[model samples]
Each structure stands twice: as structure tokens, then as C-alpha cells.
Target: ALPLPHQRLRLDPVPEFEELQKAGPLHEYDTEPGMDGRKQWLVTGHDEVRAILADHERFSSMRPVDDEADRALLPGILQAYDPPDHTRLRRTVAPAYSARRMERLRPRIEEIVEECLDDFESVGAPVDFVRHAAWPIPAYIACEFLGVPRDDQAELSRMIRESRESRLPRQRTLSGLGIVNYTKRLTSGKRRDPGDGMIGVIVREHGAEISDEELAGLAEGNLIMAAEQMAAQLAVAVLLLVTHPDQMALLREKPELIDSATEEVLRHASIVEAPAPRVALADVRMAGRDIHAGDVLTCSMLATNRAPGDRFDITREKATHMAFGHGIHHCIGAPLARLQLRVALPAVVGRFPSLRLAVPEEDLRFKPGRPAPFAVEELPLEW
Candidate 1:
């Protein structure tokens, strides 16, 4: 396999991943050596990676696998814990994100979808769909859930985007901290006088067990992470539909088919690759390979979703893959992601039949980095 200039590109979509998958699902490659001069293991097999996620006791996530901090500082709570702690924190926030809650948001989300479409139409067709549909739908949804002021959301979203890209890890950390701090201040502003929406709910629920700041942290963390990925995935999922028109028409013809089509998109274009880089707490064997203690591991959910084989094979079982991961660290916002796609994709096709890539497919740009995966920029399209 061709090596890469940086390890990020290697795991993300690096030439190495392309080469490794082409050869077979389970191959190890040499990555940049850590301060310990130890090479990291980049496992690509869907089946094996799923096993790695399942055996969380053996394959941990508490520490830096590389023994060297990357440019990005890690988030605590969900991204930096194991077992009971991760599971507990997940539960505290789960009530607000349940299917019942998401179901409640559908009508509002539908309205959000249509408004974005209207904005597209007003622009005289072929607007950057990413800007119109992809960004706002989730941004507004998150704003609603977090009770962020209407005037504050655009700036907050900009802060999130630039913060994610900032080379300064401290800046990225502060970007979120700043949002939490701002939210807390907003909560204080509403103490005697309550705010209107989700932020109010968050504040009202804050008590002895859940401090206002902790609630703010949880609410902000949940909203920020969900909004960023949800909006991007929704946009990219639409891109998948437009790129594969037969499927797009299938969704349009059978409105009920939207759910299946959404699943296919999730499988086809995994919004995020790698299960956030996990560490092994003990010597663990998965897919016939041994992972020693302190070794970092990641499941290539994108690779697993796209793995070649007969669909009926036991190995190809849909639920077994790591698309949202397995066990304790499984994605908390998965159902929301699914709901947004199911509603938005078919709506786009039904609403704008003429939607097409404003630029030619050959000229379309996708992220070229490794390790983490996502659209680094908006996908431009016209009706």
C-alpha cells in the first residue's frame, strides 16, 4: 500500500486505507511512530472492528493511544470514558433524545426542511444545497433543542465551524467551553426570568444532582456534536441521492421507501469514520489478531458499511457492523440522524425534482485527509 505524508489522511481516506481495503478487510499498516516509537494499528475489517467495539473491557478508550496528543484536545464525558461512566453520562442525556422526543420534533423538523427548500427556491434554483438544506436544518434544530437565541445561532454555528478547523487545540476546546460558558450565562439571565424553549427545560431541570453548569455542559456538548454531524450528514446524504439518481427517484416514487434509502446512504457515505480511536486496557484478540494493553484501536465504520459480500452472509449482517458502533460507546444521536435523513432526503427529491450538481461530478471535491472522515466543505448544487 502507498504510505501517506500524514497519518490523518491514512485512516480517513488515506491511500493506505484504499489499498488495504482493496487487498482484504483485515490488514495492518505501519503508521507514524509515537513518542514511544511504537507503530499504531489501523484495522479496517467491519467484522473485526465490530468485535473491537464490543469488547470494550479489553479494548478501552481512556487514554491516548499514540502516547502523543494530536493537535486536537479530546472532549471528556462521552469521548473520554469507559463502561459505567460512559453509559451513565449517556443515560443522563438520553431522555431528551429518545425516539419519543425525536418523533415529537418531526413536524417542526418538517417545517424546518420546507423553509430551507423555500430559501433555495427564492435564490432562483441551484443554490448551494449544502448551505440551504444541510447547514440550517440541523443548526436550527439544535438551536431549538438548546434554546439558543435566534440571533445567537448563526454566530454560534460559525464559532463551531471555525473552532473545529482551528489548528490550536486550546482554541477548539475553548470554542466549546465558550459556548457552554455562554449558555450558562444565558441560564443565569433566565434564573428569575425563564427563557422560552429547550434551554429553559435544561435550566428548570438543573438541581442538586445536576448542577446548572453540568447541565449546560451536557446540553451544549450534546447539541454541538449532534448539530455539526447531523447537518453535514443530511447534506452529504442528499449528495448521495443526487449522485445516485435511480435511488433518488426510488425514494421519490415510494415515500415510505425513504427509511430504507436513508439506511443505504448511512451505509454508503459514513459521515464519520473510525469509532473515535479506542484504547485496549488488556491484551485482547479480535479477528484473530492480538491487541496489547494501551494500544489504540478504531473501527472503520465506513469500510464495514461498504464491505463486499453477499448481504445474507452472517458476516454481512446489518446490525453487526460498526456504523454507530456497538455496546457502551454506541452513538447516542443515531436515531436523530436517521430521522433527519429520512425526512429531509425524500422531501428534497419530492420538493425539487430538478436538483442536480451545480458543478460536474468530476470536479466535485471530497476531503483528502486520513483517520477522521467527513466533507471538509459544502457540496454545491443547483436545481
Candidate 2:
């Protein structure tokens, strides 16, 4: 058709994704050239993906994005998990992310949201929301709420950014590994001399159940993963609101809609919908397809949420979205992310009603691939 495009292409329209979803929930693909890769199937249908998520026996979440060699070189708490192990770790960690705990942070969250927005408005105009507000709110909340030292925020944030890109080749993978290792070390230190916050509580109650190694992984390792990704989610929310002024108006008119709106945004803007590569442990039938053992299954959250039917009507109800993985492995940090979005959106929009993108829409950047999609590299905004 047209001349050869840029060597580094952005999968914008997400055609391959949608087409594959319609053709069948399970679809295969080969990654870009110059990367160690193999064929992987992506399952996108709502019911199909949900069924996979529900059946832990048939499918295993233990499978990872990286291959054997990479996994061996630098293993962290994230990949070193499966059902019973993951279940035990989650039982201990889940308390910290409990709905009741998030409720307690509600007021503080509101203040944090207001303060970040104030910074945006004070700048008058021409600000990168990602830099000034979007990223900071989640980072700040996660740090302060968990008692991470203020001085450590910058480095922690940098590490968080790098971990997602660990899927790259050797050097980049090493960088990610280094950051994850650092994360483990930091949390381990905190455990020995506990503070009086979520992490502190985690160690206080379940210190015995968790090993120093696992504690470090959960505290620092998972913290970086959770905090940075949530920050990305918040950034996506900002972009969605700014682009859809009517939706912004709706939220402003009915602030209570934040809860549902957050769900809807997560559904529509599923940043990470590449179909998580899972392996089938046994024979399983999903959406009329028979899946066998050792078969690499990719259950795409985006396809399930965006399915062309009344089942996944995000505009109506978002409980159906697999944006956050479904089942027992459902994102533990969902409530917190929602809390941040609910608090942050109203504050940002209210403070700067005229806020908008600083650059043309076409120039904006996005992370490559699926499974962990996110927004602009830097959200250039004008308040």
C-alpha cells in the first residue's frame, strides 16, 4: 500500500487485536523481528477468557512473559509464584490491599488528589500532566501510604519504569533485574525496622508466614510493579477524560460516578490486554474450543471487555472487563487504583476546567505490545 513505515511502528488502531478477537478468542502471533520469540496464542472472547481465569486447574498463571534463560538469570517475587504459593502470599498481602483499608485512605487520597491538581493549576498552563500530576499522585500515595522514604521516590519511580521493559533483550532485561533486586533489598530493610503503615502492618501481622526474601519481594518488588502500573492507569484515565469532554462533564455533574467511571475507563482503555500467556495444565474446553496441556493460552482482557455484544457493555456496566486479570489472580491493587482515580479525576478536572493536551493527538506516544498497555510517555497538558 503506502511506502514502508517507520521501523519502529506503533500498533495504534489495534486491528490485529480486534480481528483476532472476532475470529476466535484464541489466536496466535509471532513477535517482531530480531527478538527471541515463538508463536503465542491470544484468547480474547469475554466468556472464554473468563472461563480460563476461573479454571486455575486447567490453566496455570505460573507461565511468564520471558522464556527459560531470561527467567533463570533474574528471578523475582513476581514470577516465583503459583497457586498454593501465590495463594498464601496473596492471603498475607491481600490484607494490605483490602477494601476496608482503602476506605480508611479515602480522605487522605482526596487530599493528595487536591494537592496534585493545585500544582497543575498553579503552573497556569503548558504542563505535562504525566510529570506533574498523573504519575506523582499514585507514586506519592503509594509511598506515603506505605511509609517509603521521600528521598527514595525518584529512584523507585525510575526502577518501576524500567521493570515493565525488562522483556527487552539482555542489557534492558538486566536493568530491570537490577531494579527488582534493589526493590527487594529496600523492602527487606524496612521489614527489620518496621514503620507504621501498610507495609509495616504487613510485616507486623504476617511476618512469620512471609520469609525475609518473600517479604522483600512483596514490599519493594511488588510495590514498584504496583505503584508504577497504577500511575500508568491514572495517566490513562486523565487522557480518557480530557479527550471525552462529555464524559468529563458527566463525572463533574455526578461526582459519585467516579466508582463506575473508573471501571468503565479501565474497560475501554485496557492498557494491558495482550492476552496474558498462560499454559494449560490439563484438557479444557472454552468457548467451544478444546484446549490441551502445554498449550500456551493467552486470555486477553481487552477483547473480553470490548467484545461486540451486550455481555461486555462497558458504557453500561464494567464488571465484565478483564482489564485487570480475572479470578483469584485479579489485581489486588484494583481498589486502590480506583480510589486514586476517583479522588484524582474530580480534583484535576475541577481545579482546571480548561485543562487539555498540549500537543496534537497524533504525536502522542504509547507503549508497544499488549498485556501491559499505558499512555503517553509524557502527558503534555495545559491547565
Candidate 2 lDDT tens digits, 226-248:
66777678787778788777777
Model number with the top TM-score: 2
Candidate 2 whole-model C-alpha lDDT, 0 to 1? 0.65
Q: Candidate 1 lDDT (Cα, whole model)?
A: 0.64
Clashes of each: 9, 5
Candidate 2, TM-score vs. the true structure? 0.82
**lDDT by candidate, in order shown:** 0.64, 0.65
lDDT tens per residue, model 1, 1-383: 22332223311344544566776555555533453443367667666776777777777766564444553433334766676766665555666666787788788878877987788778865577666667778877777666678788778876665565566888888786777677667656655555555445444553333445555566666767767787667766777667767766766787876666666666655666666566666776666667677565545665666544312111122443355777778887788788888778878899767668877766655553243446536567776
Candidate 2 residues lying further than 4 Å off, grouped into runs, are 1-13, 28-40, 64-80, 158-186, 307-315, 369-371
For candidate 1, the 10 contiguous residues with the lowest summed lDDT are 308-317
> Local error of candidate 1 at 89, Å?
1.3
True lDDT of residue 251, candidate 1: 68
